[PDB]
Structures are given as structure tokens and as C-alpha cells.
């Protein structure tokens, strides 16, 4: 939830704490077995740093358990600005592209395909770049090569879960976020029989890819603007998948690869399987 003050009247960094409530922790003043209000299954409190230790011990000594702690300053921050992704920009690689134009595409591709994540000089792929700019490879095909590359696998696919990798994939290859639990299930099954290459192939091959930026257009962010057959919630999920500019998909950070989109949220948009 929103927190209204970053700091207590006495100086003290507030910290939002989220717990699963337990009947002992709060109960109705009613006859019969004590029940916590259902709406507050996940309770949140903002506590000053001083009372944080005591607060957390008490929660845990009852049947409570801590879902997560977060500094109030990071919380109660604006939802990321969509300014740059509201209109993506878009890059076209003409035939007979001069030297600079090819460079721009390359850069743009690395940006979108890898997230903000930085690609070092050694990481960068000369061979693939070589092919582009003497013809022979489509922008589309380059994009396939990047997702095949180990660089991609090491960041996105080898650290996190396949559940996470799918949506990670969706965002990079298609601006969209994933809609529905089915998409996640389909990709997982594809991966088990066909393997990693076939799964990567299935996003570029998909008509949604073809319909937008089909060939010789660097992929851009379709999500954040209204798309055909897109669940309304997907738009919200795009805010979870995409956090600000200068926010990346990073194996590097503590517990780097986690799920931006909770499984339950996916279930809301659609169920059936």
C-alpha cells in the first residue's frame, strides 16, 4: 500500500513490513473461534527503525510470517514513467543501410533484447554484427541469434525459473507482457520436448511478432498501449515487468531472478487448462 510519510516525527527511517496475519495477531471481538478479517490476510505496517526488531519478533512468535520488508522511501515512489515506452520510437534497417544506420539498429537491438542490462565489449558478438551490413541476415534473424546466444541464456534462462524466463522472453521479443496462465503453460511444454531453441524460435515465428516489426524492424514495446486480444490486466502486469528507465533484468543483483508477475495475477486474466 501507499505510505504517506517517509520518516517519523523523531528522525527515523520508516520500513513497510508485510506479514501473513494470524488469528492470534488480530481477531474479531466476537463469540466463537477467533478469525482475522479475511481482507487482511496480508497485513502491512510501517514501523520506525527502532521498533522494527520488536515488531518482527512478535509477529514471528505468533504464527505470523514475514512476506517482505521494504524501506518506505523506495515504497511510496511514483509508478515508473511510461514516457519513453508510451511511444517506443522504432528502428527500421533499410536495405543499403550506410555504416551509421546499421550501428544504431545494433545498439537498439541489444537494448531491447537484453533489457537495460549492459553488454561488455567481450560479450558483444562480432560475427552476428558482421552478417548484418553485408546483407544476409534480417534484423529478425539477428534477434534470433541473440536469444540463441549464451549471453542471453546465462542472464535470463540459466539463473531464473522457466516460469520467469517465459515472461522475461515475452517482454524482450514482444513489447507485450504475458496474458493468461495458458501462454505460460504452452511455452513450458514446448521447452520440455523441443528444447530451448524451439521455444526461442516460437516467439520470433509467432504472427504477433510478424504483424508488428515483422522483418527488419527492431522490436519495440507494444505493451503500455492498447493491443488487440490483450487482457486489461496485462497492461498492469507491464508496469510490474518494466520498472523505470535504468531498471534492468539482472541476474547480478541479490536473488537476481525472481518473478515480477505473481502466478495468481496471471490466473485472474484467464483460467481453464
Amino acid at each position: 500500500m501507499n505510505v504517506l510519510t517517509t520518516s517519523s516525527q523523531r528522525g527515523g527511517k520508516l520500513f513497510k513490513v508485510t506479514m501473513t496475519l494470524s488469528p492470534a495477531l488480530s481477531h474479531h471481538p466476537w463469540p466463537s473461534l477467533d478469525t482475522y478479517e479475511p481482507s487482511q490476510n496480508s497485513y502491512s505496517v510501517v514501523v520506525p527503525l527502532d521498533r522494527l526488531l520488536a515488531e518482527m519478533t512478535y509477529i514471528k512468535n505468533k504464527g505470523g510470517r514475514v512476506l517482505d520488508i521494504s524501506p518506505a522511501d523506495l515504497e511510496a515512489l511514483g509508478p515508473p514513467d511510461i514516457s519513453s515506452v508510451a511511444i517506443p520510437l522504432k528502428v527500421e534497417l533499410w536495405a543499403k543501410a550506410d555504416v551509421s544506420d546499421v550501428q544504431a539498429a545494433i545498439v537498439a537491438a541489444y537494448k531491447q533484447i537484453f533489457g537495460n542490462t549492459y553488454v561488455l565489449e567481450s560479450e558483444r558478438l562480432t560475427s552476428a554484427e558482421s552478417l548484418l551490413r553485408n546483407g544476409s541476415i534480417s534484423v529478425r534473424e539477428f534477434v534470433r541469434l541473440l536469444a540463441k546466444s549464451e549471453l542471453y541464456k546465462e542472464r535470463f534462462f540459466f539463473c531464473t525459473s522457466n516460469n520467469r524466463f517465459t515472461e522475461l522472453n515475452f517482454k524482450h521479443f514482444l513489447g507485450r507482457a504475458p496474458y493468461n496462465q495458458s501462454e505460460i503453460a504452452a511455452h513450458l511444454d514446448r521447452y520440455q520436448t523441443f528444447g530451448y531453441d524451439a521455444e526461442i524460435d516460437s516467439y520470433i515465428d509467432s504472427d504477433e511478432y510478424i504483424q508488428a516489426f515483422g522483418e527488419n524492424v527492431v522490436p519495440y514495446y507494444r505493451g503500455f498501449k492498447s493491443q488487440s486480444g490483450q487482457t486489461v490486466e496485462s497492461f498492469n502486469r507491464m508496469f510490474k515487468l518494466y520498472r523505470g528507465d535504468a531498471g534492468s533484468d539482472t541476474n547480478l543483483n541479490l536473488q537476481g531472478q525472481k518473478r515480477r508477475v505473481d502466478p495468481k495475477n496471471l490466473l485472474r486474466s484467464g483460467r481453464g487448462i
Partner: protein, 73 residues
Amino acid sequence: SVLTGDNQQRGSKLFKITIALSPTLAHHPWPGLDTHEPSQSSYSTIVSLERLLPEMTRIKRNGGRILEITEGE
């Protein structure tokens, strides 16, 4: 597009495919009705056998038809 070297990293027999291009297959990111590129109304690509079936089926459903198939080597 003449292959400078085997485009694909993963290896199988490769086949060059020349297709007449529908605007849909390569729409330009332009306002109004999308136009495929004039310079190439006949994109030619190199494909691995495994990808060859998916590539052809996707080409088929889109307007454009296969002008010719040639083994890439």
C-alpha cells in the same frame, strides 16, 4: 540474400528460399497502408531443414508465394 557463411549457428543442411513478399510479411513502420520494400519484392533467406517447414507454412498463410527453393550450398 547471398549467405556469406552458414548464417545459422545450429547445424543442419541449409536451403535458400526466394519468396515474393506481401506487405504484411515485411510491413514498413509507416502511417497508413504498410508497404513492403521496393528494392526487395523477393526476399531470399537461408534456412535449416528443421526450420524449413515452419518458414514455408508462415510464408504460405501470408500472401507471398515461394518463387523458388534452392539448397543453400
